[PDB]
Amino acid sequence: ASATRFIQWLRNWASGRDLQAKLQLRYQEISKRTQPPPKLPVGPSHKLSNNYYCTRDGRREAMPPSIVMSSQKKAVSPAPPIKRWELSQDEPYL
Amino acid sequence: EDNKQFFGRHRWVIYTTEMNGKNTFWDVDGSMVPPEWHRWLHCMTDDP
Amino acid sequence: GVRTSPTGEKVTHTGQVYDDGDYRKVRFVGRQKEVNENFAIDLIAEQPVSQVGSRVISCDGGGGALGHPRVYINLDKETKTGTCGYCGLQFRQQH
Amino acid sequence: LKKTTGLVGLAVCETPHERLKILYTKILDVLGHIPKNAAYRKYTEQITNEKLSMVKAEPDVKKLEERLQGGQIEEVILQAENELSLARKMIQWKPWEPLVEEPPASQWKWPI
Amino acid sequence: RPTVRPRNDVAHKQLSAFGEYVAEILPKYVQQVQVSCFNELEICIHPDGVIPVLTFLRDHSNAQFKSLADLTAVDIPTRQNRFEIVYNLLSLRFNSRIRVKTYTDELTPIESSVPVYKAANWYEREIWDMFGVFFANHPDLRRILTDYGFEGHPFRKDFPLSGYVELRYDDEVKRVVAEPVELAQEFRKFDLNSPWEAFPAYRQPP
Amino acid sequence: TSVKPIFSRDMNEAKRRVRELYRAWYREVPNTVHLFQLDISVKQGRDKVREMFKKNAHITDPRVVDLLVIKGKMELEETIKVWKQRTHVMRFFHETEAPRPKDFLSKFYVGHDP
Amino acid sequence: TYKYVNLREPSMDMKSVTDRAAQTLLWTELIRGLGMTLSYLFREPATINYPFEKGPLSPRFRGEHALRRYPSGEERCIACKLCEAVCPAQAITIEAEPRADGSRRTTRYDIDMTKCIYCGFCQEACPVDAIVEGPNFEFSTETHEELLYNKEKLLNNGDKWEAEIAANIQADYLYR
Amino acid sequence: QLITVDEKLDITTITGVPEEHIKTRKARIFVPARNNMQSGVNNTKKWKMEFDTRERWENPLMGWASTADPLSNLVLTFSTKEDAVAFAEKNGWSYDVEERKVPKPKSKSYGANFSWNKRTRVSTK
Amino acid sequence: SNLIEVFVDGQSVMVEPGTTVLQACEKVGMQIPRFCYHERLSVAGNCRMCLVEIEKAPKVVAACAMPVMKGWNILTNSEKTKKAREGVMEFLLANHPLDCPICDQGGECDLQDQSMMFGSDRSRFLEGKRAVEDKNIGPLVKTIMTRCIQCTRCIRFASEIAGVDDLGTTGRGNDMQVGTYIEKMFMSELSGNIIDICPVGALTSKPYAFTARPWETRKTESIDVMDAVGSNIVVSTRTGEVMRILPRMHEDINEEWISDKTR
Amino acid sequence: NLTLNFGPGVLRLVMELSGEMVRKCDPHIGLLHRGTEKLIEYKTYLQALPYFDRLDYVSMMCNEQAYSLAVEKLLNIRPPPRAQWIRVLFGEITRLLNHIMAVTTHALDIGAMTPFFWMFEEREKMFEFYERVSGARMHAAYVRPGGVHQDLPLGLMDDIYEFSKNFSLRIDELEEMLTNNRIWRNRTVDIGIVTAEDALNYGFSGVMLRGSGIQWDLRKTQPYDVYDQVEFDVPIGSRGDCYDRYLCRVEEMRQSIRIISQCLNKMPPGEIKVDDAKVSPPKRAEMKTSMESLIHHFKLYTEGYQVPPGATYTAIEAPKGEFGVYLVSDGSSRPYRCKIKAPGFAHLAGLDKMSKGHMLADVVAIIGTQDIVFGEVDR
Ligand SMILES: CCCCCCCCCCCCCCCCCC(=O)OC[C@H](COP(=O)(O)OCCN)OC(=O)CCCCCCCCCCCCCCCCC
Ligand code: SF4
Ligand code: SF4
Ligand code: SF4
Ligand code: SF4
Ligand code: FES
Ligand SMILES: [K+]
Ligand SMILES: [Zn+2]
């Protein structure tokens, strides 16, 4: 950021870019190293009522595998065939 | 400090030439920085 | 409370010190035995007993969420103080 | 006619309709050597016949690719070759026969 | 419900239908088909069916599992056939995954699946190295991860964590030597299991 | 009690593979000593090969014999192709191990192990 | 959605073919690359002047361990062994017994700093903020033995660094 | 095609275990006793195999507990004692089997606390 | 022939008349949560952790005490049963002290473990907690009576097993306290067993205090040689040192008890 | 044919050469095998998490995500939306970290050394983002089952925005050095051609597939966290060579910036770990006042949470390809088995196939194009 006008012009010309607008060295734009204290929010289970654990217990809703066939009609695929991808409209080609 | 330098070079220390009876004119160590200044020098805080 | 043994070695706050015939103290020759001089047992014994006007008092160790889990201490016995199990601070009921 | 399939090692096919008609016909030929009640024959004949009807109904390659939903027509040709190769292997394996052996009783029990 | 993983019945039904589809087509080899509560389809097969079942899944037009994601083993010493061999396959055409499992013991060889997937070459070498399962007709079966001359199969449940030998440089012989393992600090085994049951849904009959 | 074999149907064919492996190991020892510049003799190397073979002389299962030959052939390939280094070949001889006591009294003096 | 990174046809007019011939024979795109390194030569470097200048760190930084006290000087650690239990590397070893005043305190608290993975799980698990990873990262030693910390070393680290440790905790404890 | 093998299953020679840790070790096959500190019984379901305890000594430097026993931490889990015994036999380990201890059914009656004429009458609640 | 048919979650079991609901459930491998119930002590029915729904019965029954009737379907995992456990656990923890890090029970605590498995995962208790005076009952058993959950296991053990009526409850309601009332030592050859049966850290071994955590100990099942009874024991060791002695159940010898000398 | 035992991550290559032509390539690995998978069986689920930082030790947080997703699937819980947005944000920062390492060390290996220095100052700035959220520059252990460990410090997103605003210019400078350089193209174009069918059968994934025209990206076809809520393009090659895979990786760096820009704007409020204290530890203030909280904190950090029994294969689109874990739970608080699927394992297994008919110096390029870290290959 302290480079002379000539040196700024020289390196801009050699690179073909406006290097001064996107310097890779950080100056004052960074955020201050001392910040005000946070006050973080709480989750949906922070309630005083209507909040029994048995109604929100994910682990106890897990089940053993469903056995569809044990040793003791239209054809099907594991899922529908995947759909063709669409070419990008942002920039289809490099 | 010089806030016109880029982040990282905007703070520095010039070590004392003697610390706890050890000649440190040429032998400087990063561990000579005491804890209260350590926080400031490493930018863990803004206030010295 | 750093005391030193007859052989000159400092006794730690845990009571450790190599005895006379212990070869292991050779490790300190030409070097030093690192000992912390601030015995927490002697430091907590310096704090005064806090006089309170309730049968039950709570201690979180000070500093709110920066202390220890908050515990409630019964002060019914009058022949001793109530001691916090976490930080060692003492309490006594007034009158 | 497209310049490329976009997949390395997969060449464009100039005559996809004829190529697919030949492969599907070959598949139904090999499937005739499989017992009539084998599930593999019944299912493979059904899906092969469905693809064959599309090929006979749609002269346009791009619309055929849309009906088949198997990617580029060159990908569909390759899958037909894979099915034909598989069908010949099924004749040797005869997987429609009963289970060779039951596992030990606790073989598939988890947790132990 | 914000903290509970949502179910997907459409995928569960699709995978159940395809599981039956496979069982009907290869009854010679399929022993069990199950779909887990998070929608993963497992086909358990007799080990004779490795090549036929994998070939069908790779090549059948209604399957097209062209990618072997992974191949590994699990050691379960309480079983008569202690080693469970697991194949995880991916179908790009149908955007689906499937798991094929079979079994073997210390002395029974499994047919190498390199003919079906070239990916299997190194995976089967690792299984041989770590579990000692031999794969028949492998193009080049040998250790891959352990040191040369290493004795034993480390990933077996009865192989000790720190092994039997350790290395150091010995100045007298001017080379690295192997010696029986001694540890300055023994690894501290922890007994962590709670004596109270956590999951009633998985309780086993007494 | 009917099992799928590895390579051999019975002990007779297993023993044939064992002998072929021994011949390959026996003939390889002179090259190994020279290639790795070992400080043992060819007799010492061939004695070790016999010692390694003899410790398994009690096996009556052709499947166990088959795996032993498979592992022995793997061990030979590593040596012949110089995937092993001097340290790997010389590990068979344990020249930094002090001989552990054998009799009851010697073991009694040093510690508690059997 | 996808894009092609390299699906293009060079033009085959004379002006385009002559453009590519000149690039081949006059090395124009090589000369262009020379321009970019030339531009960097005249940029200010990113190097900082260590040890007189230090790379920036945050209050969460996980450095050398220390054992902390209450303001009274009493040890915070009450030998609960949660840190030992959680330690992924089994780098912590603890023994405890009733102190002469009945207090629940450790008689051994070792951290093998060559087993430690500096993961911070011990300071998460501690219910009393007793064990922390401090801000110091400049404690390399000349011998392996110097990195086997016992309770005396760790208490001395706490007394040495508490001024900075407490300030860092003050900045981050509302995020915990 | 299959073959007939009439031999006892022995894999000691292909496991890589040193000989000293096969012949000299004594495996213990047992169902763990309930930890008397707690009432839960979920840790008494499976069979466990562990090996004989061997020397631990103090590390001169730190006082840590050192060992030279590679199997000091090896504990295996089995659904039945038969599975545990089968695993022990093929690995060459001599073993002791301890039969499962099960609490015997008890006869409990809240009403006996108030017996008219029996000693089961409780003096407090 | 004497057996009656009941159902545990719809699965039939044949039990002897007089079998409690809690015992019917353990015939199908289901362990009902409990605190006051101990199978070797008289039934108390005060903790209420064993409450369980009977199908088509509006009121939850105490499984430890209620005899099972023919044809009952016990719903050990219904919403009513789960809500009953959550509420009782919430009441148990309302006044309990935040002591786990300094409490010897931590890591082998039934209050911790059943709170993890059967209770809620948070607190809505916004008041101050009860705090209780400690009692001195000898050199062997340390008392931290703020941890007591008033299960009366120690009282029943002392009275029935040790035949010593020195333990009782004094006061009433939330102020009810377990102890001796007067300054008295509970010195009996079986006294150390109240440490094991106390579900919480209210009664702990004084010699064992603070030395180890349960997860780090290695259990060696062994035999006692202090007398000729041959009590079955577990020797807890850590890093090559004996830390404590625990009873090992043996129905035909020591049941689940040991003497103070053995312990 | 001449035989050579090259090499002393660390790689040993045994190559058979015929003049200048590689006749065979035999990679000998395991020089960094550290029994991670066995060690994990002695750890609780939380204790095993830091092992995943040290697999592909250039993509630390992506590895954490794959493991956490697998555990959450077995647990039947889900992380809160803000945790999911943080995980996608840092997953794409991690992709930039990896891709910078891949391209520049690929270039450094073949003599183009300067771009390494330019872009590693960019890596150093992203190491700061890692340190500010977790206190560690690389092995953050920040993404955990149930969410993330802590919320972002105030002011971090502002600095990520400032970093991102200028980064595409850094990519442009890297392209000026390599993309049109005839020496770079001579070293990369038509080197290591892999066909679409060979790529699938050999088990390739990621750019090793897309370089050959296969339209596959797990972030699109099998999305996880909030990847279905962001917009981006998948780069696709046409020739399946080293040059096209170089272009794919450079373009993927640009698409990562595009995603990062969306994560910054759409970051929602709320908690950052599942509000279920039987899985995720309670806040420290709760742990020190509420009895239930203290119990659950105590048990989570000693026993750990128990995971319902079952087995899952979970995969993500990691920067090096498909990274998955086959995680088996026996119902306890420690995993029974954890097989790590590392994409570089199958890629390196294809080196012999890919190097056929090439010269010795091409093998260096082909190893670079595969993006090989032996932390994950050897595990
Ligand atoms: C009136 C009638 C007059 C008659 C005479 C007219 C003649 C004028 C017209 C002819 C001009 C010819 C110019 C001669 C220069 C050499 C040309 C050349 O060979 O360049 C091509 C060479 C190979 O080209 P390549 O793309 O790799 O492959 C092509 C094969 N299919 O590629 C290369 O060699 C590239 C070089 C590789 C090394 C790169 C490092 C150098 C880059 C910096 C160069 C700086 C400039 C040098 C200045 C020196 C000053 C002393
Ligand atoms: S930082 Fe991690 S590895 Fe190091 S002592 Fe703490 S918990 Fe153990
Ligand atoms: S440092 Fe903290 S977690 Fe570790 S034993 Fe002490 S109080 Fe417990
Ligand atoms: S009795 Fe159990 S719940 Fe209560 S403080 Fe002790 S360990 Fe914690
Ligand atoms: S001291 Fe223990 S056993 Fe006695 S009533 Fe209280 S909790 Fe129950
Ligand atoms: S166990 Fe039934 S009320 Fe206590
Ligand atoms: K107790
Ligand atoms: Zn306090």
What is the SS3 assignment for H14-70? HCCCCCHHHHCCEEEEECCCCCCCCCCCCCCCCEEEEECCCCEEECCCCCCEEECCC
DSSP bridge pairs for E45 = E30
**Residue entry with tokens 């609640």:** H125
What is each CA distance from I215 to E193, I106, J356, in whole angstroms?
9, 10, 56
Closest CA to I29 of C2, E197, C38: E197
Q: Cα(J39)–Cα(I110) distance, rounded to whole angstroms?
A: 30
User: Following CA atoms E181, E184, E187, E188 in sequence, which dihedral angle do they give, to the nearest 10 degrees?
Assistant: 150
Of E23, D43, H99, I243, the residue nearest G97 (C-alpha): I243
What is the rounded CA–CA span in Å between residue I97 and residue I131? 8
Give the H/E segment covering residue I110: helix I110-118
Q: Which residues contact E27 (CB under 8 A, 6 or more apart)?
A: D39, D95, D96, D97, D98, D99
Which residues sit directly before a break in chain F (C to N > 2.5 Å)?
A: none
Residue with tokens 């340190």: J131
| Look-up of token digits 């707690």 | H38
Mutation pick from G69, G70, G168 vs chain C, by most beta carbons of C within 10 Å, is G70
Residue A25 distance to chain G (closest CA, Å)? 7
Query: Is the CB of residue F72 less than 8 Å from the CB of residue F25?
Result: yes
User: Measured between alpha carbons, how far is residue G11 from residues A92, G16, G18, J83 in Å?
Assistant: 19, 6, 11, 50
Q: What gap in Å lies between CA F113 and CA I47, rounded to an integer?
A: 51
Is residue J205 packed enough to be buried (19+ CB in 10 Å), middle (13-18) or exposed (0-12)?
A: buried
User: Would you say E40 and E99 are in contact if contact means Cβ atoms under 8 Å apart?
Assistant: yes
Q: Which of F85, F76, F65 is nearest to F16 (CA)?
A: F65
CA distances from J155 to A36, F41, G165, I94, J135 (A): 10, 72, 22, 40, 15
Cβ distance of G36 and A92 shorter than 8 Å: no
CA–centroid distance for J137 within its chain: 16
Q: Which chains touch E (3 or more CB pairs under 8 A)?
A: A, D, F, G, H, I, J
| Spatial separation of the C-alpha atoms in residues J169 and J176, rounded to whole Å | 11
Return the structure tokens found at G32.
């262009």
Find the angle CA(G65)-CA(G147)-CA(E183) to the nearest 5 degrees.
Answer: 115
- Angle ∠(I44,I50,I51) on CA atoms, nearest 5: 110
Task: Please give the Cα distance from J179 to J184 (Å, whole number).
Answer: 7
Residue I139: is the preceding peptide bond cis (ω within 30°)?
no
CA distances from residue D80 to D28, D49, E183 in whole angstroms, order as listed: 11, 12, 61
Give yes or no for a contact between I231 and I224, defined as CB atoms under 8 angstroms apart. Answer: yes
Strands (E), J223-377: 234-236, 310-318, 321-329, 337-341
List I255's β-bridge partners, or say none. Answer: I250
DSSP state letter for D71: S
Is the distance from CB of E178 to CB of E167 less than 8 angstroms?
A: yes
- What is the DSSP annotation of G43-101? SPP----TTTS-----TT---SEEE-B-TTS-BS-----HHHHH-TT--EEEEEEE-TT
> In 3D, which of I102, I209, I147, I112 has the Cα closest to residue E195?
I112
Question: Which of E149, E121, E145 shows the shortest CA–CA distance to E135?
Answer: E121
User: In terms of C-beta density within 10 A (0-12 exposed, 13-18 middle, 19 or more buried), how is residue G166 classed?
Assistant: middle
Task: Kindly state whether I149 is in contact with chain J, defined as any CB-CB distance less than 8 angstroms.
Answer: no
Which ligand sits nearest to residue I110's alpha carbon? 4
CA quadruple E30, E35, E36, E41: dihedral sign: positive
Residue H105 structure tokens: 């059914």
Q: At H28, list the tokens.
A: 């213990």
Helix axes J60-75, J81-109, angle to 10 degrees: 140
The whole-angstrom distance between residue G110's C-alpha and the CA centroid of its chain comes to 21
H66: which strand partners?
H57
User: Which residues, other chains included, contact F59 with Cβ-Cβ below 8 Å and sequence gap of 6+?
Assistant: F65, F68, H10, H13
Chains that touch B (3 or more CB pairs under 8 A): A, G
Q: Return all residues near J110 (Cβ < 8 A) that are at least 6 apart.
A: J184, J187, J361, J364, J365, J368
Using left for φ > 0, alpha for ψ between -120 and 50, and beta otherwise, residue J111 falls in left
Rounded to whole angstroms, how far apart are CA atoms A53 and H27?
Answer: 44
Q: How far apart are CA J147 and CA J80, in angstroms?
A: 7
SS3 F10: coil
Per-position DSSP letters for B15-47, written without gaps between them: --SEETTEE-SS---GGGS-HHHHHHHTTS-S-
Maximum distance among all alpha carbons in chain D? 60
Give residues after which chain A gaps, C-N over 2.5 angstroms. 72
Query: Which residue in the block uniquely carries the two structure tokens 């520059």?
Result: J137
Q: Do I123 and J303 touch (CB under 8 A)?
A: no
Of I136, C44, C38, C16, nearest in space to G101 by CA: C44
Tell me if chain I has a CB within 8 Å of the CB of C56. yes
Helix axes D39-57, D61-68, angle to 10 degrees: 150
Contact A69, E33 (CB under 8 A): yes
Report the alpha-carbon distance of residue C72 to residue C51 in Å, rounded: 15
Nearest of E127, E140, E133, E71 to residue E99 by alpha carbon: E71
CA–CA distance, D10 with J239 (Å, rounded to integer): 11
Distance G130 CA to ligand 3 centre (A): 6
Element at D82 (helix H, strand E): helix D73-93
Give the torsion through C-alpha atoms of F98, F104, F110, F113, to 10 deg: 90
* Residues whose CB is less than 8 angstroms from the CB of residue A23 and which lie 6 or more positions away in sequence, other chains included: A1, J166
Q: Is G114 in the pocket of ligand 2 (CB under 6 A)?
A: no
DSSP strand pairing (E67-75 vs E83-91) = antiparallel
What is the DSSP secondary structure assignment for residue J165, as one 8-state letter? H
Minimal C-alpha gap between D44 and chain J (Å): 23
Per DSSP bridges, beta strands H56-58 and H65-67 are antiparallel
Q: Which residues contact H118 (CB under 8 A, 6 or more apart)?
A: H112
Nearest alpha carbon to residue J55 among J366, J343, J348, J367: J343
Query: Strand order of the sheet with strand I4-8?
Result: I11-15, I4-8, I73-75, I51-54, I61-62
Q: What are the distances in angstroms from CA I208 to CA A60, H36, I204, I205, I234?
A: 37, 15, 8, 5, 15
- Give residues with Cβ within 8 angstroms of F52, minimum separation 6: F92
Q: Residue G16: helix, strand or coil by DSSP?
A: helix
Residue H89: burial class (beta carbons within 10 Å; 0-12, 13-18, 19+): middle
Contact yes or no for E57/E117 (Cβ under 8 A): no
Closest chain G residue by Cα to residue J245: G5
CB contact (8 A) between residue D8 and residue J311: no
Structure tokens given for I186? 């509970």
Q: Can you tell me which residue has the tokens 């069918």?
A: J197
Q: How much helix, strand and coil, in percent to the nearest 5, is found in chain I?
A: 20, 20, 60
E strand or H helix at J26 = strand J21-28
Q: Hey, which residues does A66 pair with through a beta bridge?
A: E35
By what technique were these coordinates determined?
cryo-EM
Long-range contacts of J255-259 (CB under 8 A, 24+ apart): J256/J92, J256/J93, J256/J95, J256/J96, J256/J99, J257/J96, J257/J164, J257/J167, J257/J168, J258/J231, J258/J232, J259/J88, J259/J92, J259/J230, J259/J232
Our CA dihedral for I134, I136, I139, I143, rounded to 10 degrees, sits at -30
**Ligand 1 pocket mutation pick from G27, G36, G37, G38 by most atoms within 8 angstroms of CB:** G27
Contact H88, H95 (CB under 8 A): yes
Q: Looking at the partner chain, which of I99, I102, I132 has a beta carbon nearest the beta carbon of C74?
A: I132
Residue identified by tokens 């007494």 is E206
CA distances from G18 to A6, D89, G33, J186 (A): 35, 58, 21, 21
Cβ atoms within 10 Å, residue A19: 20
- Residue in the block written with tokens 């070792």: G110
Q: How far is the CA of A53 from the centre of ligand 4 (A)?
A: 21
Closest atom, ligand 6, to C-alpha of I63: 2
Q: For D102, which of A71, A74, A84 is closest by C-beta distance? A: A71
As a whole number of angstroms, the longest Cα–Cα distance in chain A is 86
Residue with tokens 């000691």: H12
CA I247 to chain centre: 15
Q: Would you tell me how many other CB atoms lie within 10 Å of the CB of residue B20?
A: 7
Which tokens go with I87? 């509420």
Q: Which pairing describes strands C90-93 and C50-52: parallel, antiparallel, or unpaired?
A: parallel
CB atoms within 10 A of CB J190: 15
Query: What span, in angstroms and rounded, lies between the C-alpha atoms of F42 and F39?
Result: 10
Tokens of I52: 């369980």
CB-based contacts of G122, cutoff 8 Å, min separation 6: G65, G83, G86, G87, G92, G131, G133
Chain H residues with CB under 8 Å of I38 CB are 39
d(CA J142, CA G175): 13
The two three-digit tokens of residue I210, written as one number: 């603070």
- In angstroms, the Cα distances linking A83 to B38, I123, J229 are 58, 49, 18
The reported resolution of this PDB entry, expressed in Å, is 2.4
DSSP 8-state class, residue F68: H
User: Which residue(s) pair with C92 in the sheet?
Assistant: C51
CA distances from G96 to C87, D6, D110, G81 (A): 16, 69, 41, 9
Instruction: Decide if J241 contacts J188 (C-beta within 8 A).
Output: yes
